[PDB]
RNA sequence: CGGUAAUUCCAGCUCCAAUAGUGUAUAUUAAAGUUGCUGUGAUUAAAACGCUCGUAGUUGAAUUA
């Protein structure tokens, strides 16, 4: 995997968006990602979202708690 | 309302409202969603330019941990 920085709110490819989606892909080589959905619902009076990498045909580097799976 | 049987005219009695106040005339506001920001209407009641291009004006997709 790539080592590149995320800078304070720099480029678009030092933006915390293109990072996530750059370790998704380096992290994830050979498998491909065809598919992302996330499952917004309340709990406890909170918003828990909850990203999904779908068709897939982290946590460490990252920080997003997303479940990986295959399309149905 | 009154053209011959007037609940409205000119009168008489009776009683209604307000009251040291009570009508008139003009004008402002509300009524008036009959000037619309909140808030109107445009087939037929008033009201979509004959149609297209177009500058000013107004309005402009998602995205940056």
Redesign the pocket.
């Known amino acids: 995997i790539g080592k590149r920085v995320?800078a304070?709110?720099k480029p678009?490819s030092r933006?915390?968006?293109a990072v996530h989606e750059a370790y998704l892909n380096e992290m994830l080589y050979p498998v491909e990602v065809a598919g992302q959905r996330v499952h917004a619902t309340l709990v406890h009076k909170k918003v828990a979202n909850s990203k999904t990498v779908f068709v897939a045909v982290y946590k460490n580097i990252t920080?997003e708690k997303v479940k990986f799976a295959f399309p149905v």
Request: net charge positive; hydrophobic share 10%; charged share 25%.
């Open positions: 995320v304070h709110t678009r933006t915390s968006k920080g």
